[PDB]
């Protein structure tokens, strides 16, 4: 966790700004295509804690760092993950872009937690 890969800003008020980081050196060592994984979920063992919301999954979605620095969203939840307002297919990688909005909890207004991703293009270049 040396260099910033992206910044996650929660727009709905529950969580302060958090950065996802990686060490390029350790990333180069990984033989698999996915070089690092960040997990978002209700279980505080996750990299990014979504809170104690029962409709959110313990491990809800993952962000995958690909071989050339692409960021991929993968939904692994019970109740769903939304990307720019659209419910994504479960376990189907989605290529993330600057400013994409990732949302969970849709279906109960009070449970909606929304996040906007800003990607550090410099990290990608450097990788």
């Amino acid at each position: 966790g040396e260099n910033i890969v992206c910044r996650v800003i929660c727009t709905t008020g529950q969580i302060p700004i958090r950065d996802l980081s990686a060490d390029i050196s350790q990333v180069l060592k990984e033989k698999r295509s996915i070089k690092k994984v960040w997990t978002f979920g209700r279980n505080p063992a996750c990299d990014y804690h979504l809170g104690n919301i029962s409709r959110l999954s313990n491990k809800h979605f993952q962000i995958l760092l690909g071989e050339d620095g692409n960021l991929l969203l993968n939904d692994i939840s019970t109740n769903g993950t939304w990307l720019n307002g659209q419910k994504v297919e479960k376990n189907s990688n989605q290529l993330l872009s600057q400013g994409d909005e990732i949302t969970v909890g849709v279906g109960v207004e009070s449970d909606i937690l929304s996040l906007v991703i800003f990607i550090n293009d410099k990290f990608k270049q450097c990788l």
Binding site: R42, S54, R55, S57, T78, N79
Partner: peptide
């Protein structure tokens, strides 16, 4: 807490 998720 870590209970099984409430399913819609």
């Amino acid at each position: 807490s870590l209970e099984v998720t409430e399913a819609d």
